[PDB]
mmCIF file with all atom_site columns, all heavy atoms in Angstrom:
data_model
loop_
_atom_site.group_PDB
_atom_site.id
_atom_site.type_symbol
_atom_site.label_atom_id
_atom_site.label_alt_id
_atom_site.label_comp_id
_atom_site.label_asym_id
_atom_site.label_entity_id
_atom_site.label_seq_id
_atom_site.pdbx_PDB_ins_code
_atom_site.Cartn_x
_atom_site.Cartn_y
_atom_site.Cartn_z
_atom_site.occupancy
_atom_site.B_iso_or_equiv
_atom_site.pdbx_formal_charge
_atom_site.auth_seq_id
_atom_site.auth_comp_id
_atom_site.auth_asym_id
_atom_site.auth_atom_id
_atom_site.pdbx_PDB_model_num
ATOM 1   N N   . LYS A 1 1  ? 7.382  97.920  59.740 1.00 0.00 ? 1028 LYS A N   1
ATOM 2   C CA  . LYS A 1 1  ? 8.262  97.992  58.580 1.00 0.00 ? 1028 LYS A CA  1
ATOM 3   C C   . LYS A 1 1  ? 9.253  99.145  58.745 1.00 0.00 ? 1028 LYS A C   1
ATOM 4   O O   . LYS A 1 1  ? 10.453 98.906  58.861 1.00 0.00 ? 1028 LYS A O   1
ATOM 5   C CB  . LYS A 1 1  ? 7.447  98.065  57.284 1.00 0.00 ? 1028 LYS A CB  1
ATOM 6   C CG  . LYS A 1 1  ? 6.730  96.776  56.891 1.00 0.00 ? 1028 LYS A CG  1
ATOM 7   C CD  . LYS A 1 1  ? 5.880  96.950  55.637 1.00 0.00 ? 1028 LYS A CD  1
ATOM 8   C CE  . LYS A 1 1  ? 5.026  95.766  55.303 1.00 0.00 ? 1028 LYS A CE  1
ATOM 9   N NZ  . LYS A 1 1  ? 4.144  96.055  54.167 1.00 0.00 ? 1028 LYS A NZ  1
ATOM 10  N N   . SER A 1 2  ? 8.736  100.379 58.772 1.00 0.00 ? 1029 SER A N   1
ATOM 11  C CA  . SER A 1 2  ? 9.492  101.549 59.197 1.00 0.00 ? 1029 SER A CA  1
ATOM 12  C C   . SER A 1 2  ? 9.361  101.652 60.716 1.00 0.00 ? 1029 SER A C   1
ATOM 13  O O   . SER A 1 2  ? 9.135  100.630 61.357 1.00 0.00 ? 1029 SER A O   1
ATOM 14  C CB  . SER A 1 2  ? 9.011  102.786 58.454 1.00 0.00 ? 1029 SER A CB  1
ATOM 15  O OG  . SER A 1 2  ? 7.835  103.337 59.030 1.00 0.00 ? 1029 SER A OG  1
ATOM 16  N N   . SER A 1 3  ? 9.511  102.860 61.280 1.00 0.00 ? 1030 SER A N   1
ATOM 17  C CA  . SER A 1 3  ? 9.285  103.150 62.694 1.00 0.00 ? 1030 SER A CA  1
ATOM 18  C C   . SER A 1 3  ? 10.439 102.588 63.529 1.00 0.00 ? 1030 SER A C   1
ATOM 19  O O   . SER A 1 3  ? 10.606 101.368 63.586 1.00 0.00 ? 1030 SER A O   1
ATOM 20  C CB  . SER A 1 3  ? 7.951  102.667 63.221 1.00 0.00 ? 1030 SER A CB  1
ATOM 21  O OG  . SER A 1 3  ? 7.686  103.216 64.506 1.00 0.00 ? 1030 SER A OG  1
ATOM 22  N N   . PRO A 1 4  ? 11.253 103.434 64.216 1.00 0.00 ? 1031 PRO A N   1
ATOM 23  C CA  . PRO A 1 4  ? 12.466 102.953 64.887 1.00 0.00 ? 1031 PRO A CA  1
ATOM 24  C C   . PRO A 1 4  ? 12.253 101.774 65.836 1.00 0.00 ? 1031 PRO A C   1
ATOM 25  O O   . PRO A 1 4  ? 12.959 100.775 65.721 1.00 0.00 ? 1031 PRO A O   1
ATOM 26  C CB  . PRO A 1 4  ? 12.976 104.183 65.631 1.00 0.00 ? 1031 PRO A CB  1
ATOM 27  C CG  . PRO A 1 4  ? 12.436 105.331 64.824 1.00 0.00 ? 1031 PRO A CG  1
ATOM 28  C CD  . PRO A 1 4  ? 11.053 104.881 64.422 1.00 0.00 ? 1031 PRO A CD  1
ATOM 29  N N   . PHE A 1 5  ? 11.244 101.887 66.713 1.00 0.00 ? 1032 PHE A N   1
ATOM 30  C CA  . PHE A 1 5  ? 10.991 100.890 67.745 1.00 0.00 ? 1032 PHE A CA  1
ATOM 31  C C   . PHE A 1 5  ? 10.384 99.592  67.205 1.00 0.00 ? 1032 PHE A C   1
ATOM 32  O O   . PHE A 1 5  ? 10.429 98.592  67.917 1.00 0.00 ? 1032 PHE A O   1
ATOM 33  C CB  . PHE A 1 5  ? 10.091 101.478 68.837 1.00 0.00 ? 1032 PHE A CB  1
ATOM 34  C CG  . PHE A 1 5  ? 10.735 102.487 69.785 1.00 0.00 ? 1032 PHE A CG  1
ATOM 35  C CD1 . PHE A 1 5  ? 11.998 103.045 69.548 1.00 0.00 ? 1032 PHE A CD1 1
ATOM 36  C CD2 . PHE A 1 5  ? 10.030 102.928 70.905 1.00 0.00 ? 1032 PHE A CD2 1
ATOM 37  C CE1 . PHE A 1 5  ? 12.527 103.992 70.412 1.00 0.00 ? 1032 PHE A CE1 1
ATOM 38  C CE2 . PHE A 1 5  ? 10.562 103.880 71.757 1.00 0.00 ? 1032 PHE A CE2 1
ATOM 39  C CZ  . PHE A 1 5  ? 11.815 104.393 71.520 1.00 0.00 ? 1032 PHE A CZ  1
ATOM 40  N N   . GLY A 1 6  ? 9.837  99.580  65.979 1.00 0.00 ? 1033 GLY A N   1
ATOM 41  C CA  . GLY A 1 6  ? 9.215  98.382  65.434 1.00 0.00 ? 1033 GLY A CA  1
ATOM 42  C C   . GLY A 1 6  ? 7.907  98.050  66.158 1.00 0.00 ? 1033 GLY A C   1
ATOM 43  O O   . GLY A 1 6  ? 7.654  96.890  66.490 1.00 0.00 ? 1033 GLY A O   1
ATOM 44  N N   . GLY A 1 7  ? 7.102  99.092  66.420 1.00 0.00 ? 1034 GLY A N   1
ATOM 45  C CA  . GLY A 1 7  ? 5.800  98.955  67.046 1.00 0.00 ? 1034 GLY A CA  1
ATOM 46  C C   . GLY A 1 7  ? 5.871  98.380  68.461 1.00 0.00 ? 1034 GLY A C   1
ATOM 47  O O   . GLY A 1 7  ? 4.994  97.602  68.839 1.00 0.00 ? 1034 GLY A O   1
ATOM 48  N N   . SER A 1 8  ? 6.919  98.752  69.211 1.00 0.00 ? 1035 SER A N   1
ATOM 49  C CA  . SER A 1 8  ? 7.032  98.461  70.633 1.00 0.00 ? 1035 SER A CA  1
ATOM 50  C C   . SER A 1 8  ? 7.068  99.779  71.400 1.00 0.00 ? 1035 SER A C   1
ATOM 51  O O   . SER A 1 8  ? 7.652  100.742 70.927 1.00 0.00 ? 1035 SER A O   1
ATOM 52  C CB  . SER A 1 8  ? 8.247  97.634  70.915 1.00 0.00 ? 1035 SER A CB  1
ATOM 53  O OG  . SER A 1 8  ? 9.407  98.253  70.383 1.00 0.00 ? 1035 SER A OG  1
ATOM 54  N N   . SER A 1 9  ? 6.443  99.808  72.575 1.00 0.00 ? 1036 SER A N   1
ATOM 55  C CA  . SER A 1 9  ? 6.294  101.012 73.379 1.00 0.00 ? 1036 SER A CA  1
ATOM 56  C C   . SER A 1 9  ? 7.635  101.641 73.783 1.00 0.00 ? 1036 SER A C   1
ATOM 57  O O   . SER A 1 9  ? 7.679  102.846 74.008 1.00 0.00 ? 1036 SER A O   1
ATOM 58  C CB  . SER A 1 9  ? 5.509  100.682 74.622 1.00 0.00 ? 1036 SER A CB  1
ATOM 59  O OG  . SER A 1 9  ? 6.185  99.694  75.394 1.00 0.00 ? 1036 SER A OG  1
ATOM 60  N N   . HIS A 1 10 ? 8.678  100.816 73.987 1.00 0.00 ? 1037 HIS A N   1
ATOM 61  C CA  . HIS A 1 10 ? 9.992  101.250 74.438 1.00 0.00 ? 1037 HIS A CA  1
ATOM 62  C C   . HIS A 1 10 ? 11.101 100.512 73.683 1.00 0.00 ? 1037 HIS A C   1
ATOM 63  O O   . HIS A 1 10 ? 10.823 99.554  72.959 1.00 0.00 ? 1037 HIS A O   1
ATOM 64  C CB  . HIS A 1 10 ? 10.168 100.911 75.910 1.00 0.00 ? 1037 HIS A CB  1
ATOM 65  C CG  . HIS A 1 10 ? 9.224  101.595 76.828 1.00 0.00 ? 1037 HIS A CG  1
ATOM 66  N ND1 . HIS A 1 10 ? 7.891  101.264 76.934 1.00 0.00 ? 1037 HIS A ND1 1
ATOM 67  C CD2 . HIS A 1 10 ? 9.449  102.551 77.742 1.00 0.00 ? 1037 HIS A CD2 1
ATOM 68  C CE1 . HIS A 1 10 ? 7.337  102.020 77.867 1.00 0.00 ? 1037 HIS A CE1 1
ATOM 69  N NE2 . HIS A 1 10 ? 8.268  102.802 78.381 1.00 0.00 ? 1037 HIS A NE2 1
ATOM 70  N N   . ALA A 1 11 ? 12.345 100.988 73.839 1.00 0.00 ? 1038 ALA A N   1
ATOM 71  C CA  . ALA A 1 11 ? 13.520 100.340 73.267 1.00 0.00 ? 1038 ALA A CA  1
ATOM 72  C C   . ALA A 1 11 ? 14.796 100.754 73.998 1.00 0.00 ? 1038 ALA A C   1
ATOM 73  O O   . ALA A 1 11 ? 14.979 101.932 74.288 1.00 0.00 ? 1038 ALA A O   1
ATOM 74  C CB  . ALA A 1 11 ? 13.640 100.662 71.806 1.00 0.00 ? 1038 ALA A CB  1
ATOM 75  N N   . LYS A 1 12 ? 15.671 99.781  74.275 1.00 0.00 ? 1039 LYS A N   1
ATOM 76  C CA  . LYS A 1 12 ? 16.994 100.059 74.804 1.00 0.00 ? 1039 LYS A CA  1
ATOM 77  C C   . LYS A 1 12 ? 17.911 100.418 73.645 1.00 0.00 ? 1039 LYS A C   1
ATOM 78  O O   . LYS A 1 12 ? 17.733 99.914  72.538 1.00 0.00 ? 1039 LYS A O   1
ATOM 79  C CB  . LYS A 1 12 ? 17.624 98.921  75.616 1.00 0.00 ? 1039 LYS A CB  1
ATOM 80  C CG  . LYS A 1 12 ? 16.989 98.707  76.980 1.00 0.00 ? 1039 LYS A CG  1
ATOM 81  C CD  . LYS A 1 12 ? 17.594 97.576  77.810 1.00 0.00 ? 1039 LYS A CD  1
ATOM 82  C CE  . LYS A 1 12 ? 16.772 97.255  79.037 1.00 0.00 ? 1039 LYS A CE  1
ATOM 83  N NZ  . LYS A 1 12 ? 17.167 96.003  79.691 1.00 0.00 ? 1039 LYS A NZ  1
ATOM 84  N N   . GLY A 1 13 ? 18.914 101.249 73.944 1.00 0.00 ? 1040 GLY A N   1
ATOM 85  C CA  . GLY A 1 13 ? 19.925 101.658 72.982 1.00 0.00 ? 1040 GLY A CA  1
ATOM 86  C C   . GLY A 1 13 ? 21.192 102.124 73.693 1.00 0.00 ? 1040 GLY A C   1
ATOM 87  O O   . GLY A 1 13 ? 21.193 102.299 74.906 1.00 0.00 ? 1040 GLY A O   1
ATOM 88  N N   . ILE A 1 14 ? 22.258 102.320 72.914 1.00 0.00 ? 1041 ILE A N   1
ATOM 89  C CA  . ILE A 1 14 ? 23.572 102.702 73.411 1.00 0.00 ? 1041 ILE A CA  1
ATOM 90  C C   . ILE A 1 14 ? 23.798 104.157 73.006 1.00 0.00 ? 1041 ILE A C   1
ATOM 91  O O   . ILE A 1 14 ? 23.693 104.463 71.820 1.00 0.00 ? 1041 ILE A O   1
ATOM 92  C CB  . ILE A 1 14 ? 24.634 101.740 72.831 1.00 0.00 ? 1041 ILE A CB  1
ATOM 93  C CG1 . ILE A 1 14 ? 24.421 100.310 73.350 1.00 0.00 ? 1041 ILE A CG1 1
ATOM 94  C CG2 . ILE A 1 14 ? 26.059 102.231 73.112 1.00 0.00 ? 1041 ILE A CG2 1
ATOM 95  C CD1 . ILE A 1 14 ? 25.195 99.241  72.598 1.00 0.00 ? 1041 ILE A CD1 1
ATOM 96  N N   . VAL A 1 15 ? 24.134 105.029 73.974 1.00 0.00 ? 1042 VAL A N   1
ATOM 97  C CA  . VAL A 1 15 ? 24.404 106.435 73.690 1.00 0.00 ? 1042 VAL A CA  1
ATOM 98  C C   . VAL A 1 15 ? 25.685 106.546 72.861 1.00 0.00 ? 1042 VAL A C   1
ATOM 99  O O   . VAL A 1 15 ? 26.723 106.057 73.294 1.00 0.00 ? 1042 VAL A O   1
ATOM 100 C CB  . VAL A 1 15 ? 24.539 107.306 74.947 1.00 0.00 ? 1042 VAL A CB  1
ATOM 101 C CG1 . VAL A 1 15 ? 24.886 108.750 74.580 1.00 0.00 ? 1042 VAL A CG1 1
ATOM 102 C CG2 . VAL A 1 15 ? 23.282 107.260 75.812 1.00 0.00 ? 1042 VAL A CG2 1
ATOM 103 N N   . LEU A 1 16 ? 25.595 107.189 71.685 1.00 0.00 ? 1043 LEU A N   1
ATOM 104 C CA  . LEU A 1 16 ? 26.738 107.454 70.816 1.00 0.00 ? 1043 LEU A CA  1
ATOM 105 C C   . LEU A 1 16 ? 27.329 108.847 71.049 1.00 0.00 ? 1043 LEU A C   1
ATOM 106 O O   . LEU A 1 16 ? 28.538 109.021 70.896 1.00 0.00 ? 1043 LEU A O   1
ATOM 107 C CB  . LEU A 1 16 ? 26.322 107.297 69.354 1.00 0.00 ? 1043 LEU A CB  1
ATOM 108 C CG  . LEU A 1 16 ? 25.951 105.887 68.894 1.00 0.00 ? 1043 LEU A CG  1
ATOM 109 C CD1 . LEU A 1 16 ? 25.592 105.965 67.421 1.00 0.00 ? 1043 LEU A CD1 1
ATOM 110 C CD2 . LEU A 1 16 ? 27.052 104.862 69.113 1.00 0.00 ? 1043 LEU A CD2 1
ATOM 111 N N   . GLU A 1 17 ? 26.478 109.828 71.389 1.00 0.00 ? 1044 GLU A N   1
ATOM 112 C CA  . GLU A 1 17 ? 26.815 111.244 71.342 1.00 0.00 ? 1044 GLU A CA  1
ATOM 113 C C   . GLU A 1 17 ? 25.961 112.003 72.347 1.00 0.00 ? 1044 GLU A C   1
ATOM 114 O O   . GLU A 1 17 ? 25.007 111.462 72.897 1.00 0.00 ? 1044 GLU A O   1
ATOM 115 C CB  . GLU A 1 17 ? 26.546 111.823 69.952 1.00 0.00 ? 1044 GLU A CB  1
ATOM 116 C CG  . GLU A 1 17 ? 27.788 111.983 69.085 1.00 0.00 ? 1044 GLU A CG  1
ATOM 117 C CD  . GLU A 1 17 ? 27.519 112.529 67.690 1.00 0.00 ? 1044 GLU A CD  1
ATOM 118 O OE1 . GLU A 1 17 ? 26.350 112.545 67.238 1.00 0.00 ? 1044 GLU A OE1 1
ATOM 119 O OE2 . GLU A 1 17 ? 28.501 112.961 67.047 1.00 0.00 ? 1044 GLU A OE2 1
ATOM 120 N N   . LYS A 1 18 ? 26.343 113.260 72.575 1.00 0.00 ? 1045 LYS A N   1
ATOM 121 C CA  . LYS A 1 18 ? 25.518 114.232 73.268 1.00 0.00 ? 1045 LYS A CA  1
ATOM 122 C C   . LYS A 1 18 ? 25.330 115.405 72.309 1.00 0.00 ? 1045 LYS A C   1
ATOM 123 O O   . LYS A 1 18 ? 26.300 115.918 71.752 1.00 0.00 ? 1045 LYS A O   1
ATOM 124 C CB  . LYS A 1 18 ? 26.179 114.599 74.598 1.00 0.00 ? 1045 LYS A CB  1
ATOM 125 C CG  . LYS A 1 18 ? 26.255 113.487 75.645 1.00 0.00 ? 1045 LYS A CG  1
ATOM 126 C CD  . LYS A 1 18 ? 27.446 113.674 76.580 1.00 0.00 ? 1045 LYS A CD  1
ATOM 127 C CE  . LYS A 1 18 ? 27.328 113.016 77.918 1.00 0.00 ? 1045 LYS A CE  1
ATOM 128 N NZ  . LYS A 1 18 ? 26.454 113.764 78.826 1.00 0.00 ? 1045 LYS A NZ  1
ATOM 129 N N   . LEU A 1 19 ? 24.064 115.775 72.092 1.00 0.00 ? 1046 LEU A N   1
ATOM 130 C CA  . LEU A 1 19 ? 23.668 116.778 71.122 1.00 0.00 ? 1046 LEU A CA  1
ATOM 131 C C   . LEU A 1 19 ? 23.058 117.941 71.894 1.00 0.00 ? 1046 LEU A C   1
ATOM 132 O O   . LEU A 1 19 ? 22.309 117.722 72.847 1.00 0.00 ? 1046 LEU A O   1
ATOM 133 C CB  . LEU A 1 19 ? 22.656 116.181 70.147 1.00 0.00 ? 1046 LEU A CB  1
ATOM 134 C CG  . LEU A 1 19 ? 23.119 114.977 69.325 1.00 0.00 ? 1046 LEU A CG  1
ATOM 135 C CD1 . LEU A 1 19 ? 21.937 114.407 68.553 1.00 0.00 ? 1046 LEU A CD1 1
ATOM 136 C CD2 . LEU A 1 19 ? 24.259 115.340 68.382 1.00 0.00 ? 1046 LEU A CD2 1
ATOM 137 N N   . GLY A 1 20 ? 23.408 119.162 71.475 1.00 0.00 ? 1047 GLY A N   1
ATOM 138 C CA  . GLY A 1 20 ? 22.785 120.372 71.973 1.00 0.00 ? 1047 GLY A CA  1
ATOM 139 C C   . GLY A 1 20 ? 21.914 120.973 70.879 1.00 0.00 ? 1047 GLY A C   1
ATOM 140 O O   . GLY A 1 20 ? 22.383 121.778 70.073 1.00 0.00 ? 1047 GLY A O   1
ATOM 141 N N   . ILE A 1 21 ? 20.643 120.583 70.872 1.00 0.00 ? 1048 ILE A N   1
ATOM 142 C CA  . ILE A 1 21 ? 19.762 120.937 69.778 1.00 0.00 ? 1048 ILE A CA  1
ATOM 143 C C   . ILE A 1 21 ? 19.161 122.298 70.113 1.00 0.00 ? 1048 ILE A C   1
ATOM 144 O O   . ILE A 1 21 ? 18.585 122.461 71.192 1.00 0.00 ? 1048 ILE A O   1
ATOM 145 C CB  . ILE A 1 21 ? 18.719 119.834 69.537 1.00 0.00 ? 1048 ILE A CB  1
ATOM 146 C CG1 . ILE A 1 21 ? 19.419 118.457 69.496 1.00 0.00 ? 1048 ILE A CG1 1
ATOM 147 C CG2 . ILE A 1 21 ? 17.920 120.131 68.264 1.00 0.00 ? 1048 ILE A CG2 1
ATOM 148 C CD1 . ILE A 1 21 ? 18.576 117.305 68.993 1.00 0.00 ? 1048 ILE A CD1 1
ATOM 149 N N   . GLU A 1 22 ? 19.351 123.260 69.195 1.00 0.00 ? 1049 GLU A N   1
ATOM 150 C CA  . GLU A 1 22 ? 18.760 124.584 69.309 1.00 0.00 ? 1049 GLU A CA  1
ATOM 151 C C   . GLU A 1 22 ? 17.249 124.469 69.095 1.00 0.00 ? 1049 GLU A C   1
ATOM 152 O O   . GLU A 1 22 ? 16.812 123.861 68.119 1.00 0.00 ? 1049 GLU A O   1
ATOM 153 C CB  . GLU A 1 22 ? 19.443 125.548 68.334 1.00 0.00 ? 1049 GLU A CB  1
ATOM 154 C CG  . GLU A 1 22 ? 18.827 126.948 68.305 1.00 0.00 ? 1049 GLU A CG  1
ATOM 155 C CD  . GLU A 1 22 ? 19.649 128.068 67.672 1.00 0.00 ? 1049 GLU A CD  1
ATOM 156 O OE1 . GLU A 1 22 ? 20.877 127.912 67.479 1.00 0.00 ? 1049 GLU A OE1 1
ATOM 157 O OE2 . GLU A 1 22 ? 19.047 129.128 67.385 1.00 0.00 ? 1049 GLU A OE2 1
ATOM 158 N N   . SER A 1 23 ? 16.467 125.077 70.001 1.00 0.00 ? 1050 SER A N   1
ATOM 159 C CA  . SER A 1 23 ? 15.011 125.020 69.962 1.00 0.00 ? 1050 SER A CA  1
ATOM 160 C C   . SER A 1 23 ? 14.449 125.799 68.769 1.00 0.00 ? 1050 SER A C   1
ATOM 161 O O   . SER A 1 23 ? 15.156 126.589 68.145 1.00 0.00 ? 1050 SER A O   1
ATOM 162 C CB  . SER A 1 23 ? 14.419 125.519 71.262 1.00 0.00 ? 1050 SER A CB  1
ATOM 163 O OG  . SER A 1 23 ? 14.321 126.938 71.288 1.00 0.00 ? 1050 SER A OG  1
ATOM 164 N N   . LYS A 1 24 ? 13.163 125.564 68.473 1.00 0.00 ? 1051 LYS A N   1
ATOM 165 C CA  . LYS A 1 24 ? 12.443 126.250 67.407 1.00 0.00 ? 1051 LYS A CA  1
ATOM 166 C C   . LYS A 1 24 ? 11.894 127.575 67.933 1.00 0.00 ? 1051 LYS A C   1
ATOM 167 O O   . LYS A 1 24 ? 11.781 127.772 69.144 1.00 0.00 ? 1051 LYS A O   1
ATOM 168 C CB  . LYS A 1 24 ? 11.330 125.350 66.850 1.00 0.00 ? 1051 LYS A CB  1
ATOM 169 C CG  . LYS A 1 24 ? 11.816 124.194 65.978 1.00 0.00 ? 1051 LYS A CG  1
ATOM 170 C CD  . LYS A 1 24 ? 10.873 123.001 65.854 1.00 0.00 ? 1051 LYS A CD  1
ATOM 171 C CE  . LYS A 1 24 ? 9.759  123.180 64.887 1.00 0.00 ? 1051 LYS A CE  1
ATOM 172 N NZ  . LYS A 1 24 ? 8.890  122.001 64.888 1.00 0.00 ? 1051 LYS A NZ  1
ATOM 173 N N   . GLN A 1 25 ? 11.501 128.450 67.001 1.00 0.00 ? 1052 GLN A N   1
ATOM 174 C CA  . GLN A 1 25 ? 11.116 129.823 67.297 1.00 0.00 ? 1052 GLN A CA  1
ATOM 175 C C   . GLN A 1 25 ? 9.638  129.853 67.688 1.00 0.00 ? 1052 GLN A C   1
ATOM 176 O O   . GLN A 1 25 ? 8.868  129.037 67.182 1.00 0.00 ? 1052 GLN A O   1
ATOM 177 C CB  . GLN A 1 25 ? 11.392 130.720 66.087 1.00 0.00 ? 1052 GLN A CB  1
ATOM 178 C CG  . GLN A 1 25 ? 12.879 130.937 65.800 1.00 0.00 ? 1052 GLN A CG  1
ATOM 179 C CD  . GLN A 1 25 ? 13.625 129.713 65.296 1.00 0.00 ? 1052 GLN A CD  1
ATOM 180 O OE1 . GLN A 1 25 ? 13.037 128.723 64.843 1.00 0.00 ? 1052 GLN A OE1 1
ATOM 181 N NE2 . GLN A 1 25 ? 14.949 129.764 65.371 1.00 0.00 ? 1052 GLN A NE2 1
ATOM 182 N N   . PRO A 1 26 ? 9.165  130.766 68.578 1.00 0.00 ? 1053 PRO A N   1
ATOM 183 C CA  . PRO A 1 26 ? 9.960  131.868 69.131 1.00 0.00 ? 1053 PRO A CA  1
ATOM 184 C C   . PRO A 1 26 ? 10.690 131.643 70.457 1.00 0.00 ? 1053 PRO A C   1
ATOM 185 O O   . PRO A 1 26 ? 11.079 132.616 71.108 1.00 0.00 ? 1053 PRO A O   1
ATOM 186 C CB  . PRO A 1 26 ? 8.814  132.887 69.263 1.00 0.00 ? 1053 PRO A CB  1
ATOM 187 C CG  . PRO A 1 26 ? 7.695  132.080 69.871 1.00 0.00 ? 1053 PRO A CG  1
ATOM 188 C CD  . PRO A 1 26 ? 7.797  130.762 69.126 1.00 0.00 ? 1053 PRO A CD  1
#
């Protein structure tokens, strides 16, 4: 119902962006 993959181990997708996510502390 929820869950991005819909209860499948993998999923193909199209790259929209490149993100530089700052890590968590410390």
Side-chain angles (χ1 to χ4, degrees):
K1028 289 177 187 174
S1029 81
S1030 192
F1032 287 11
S1035 54
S1036 60
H1037 297 73
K1039 288 180 190 168
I1041 295 166
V1042 177
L1043 293 181
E1044 259 179 345
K1045 293 152 157 283
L1046 300 173
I1048 312 192
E1049 176 164 344
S1050 83
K1051 286 157 80 182
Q1052 291 69 17

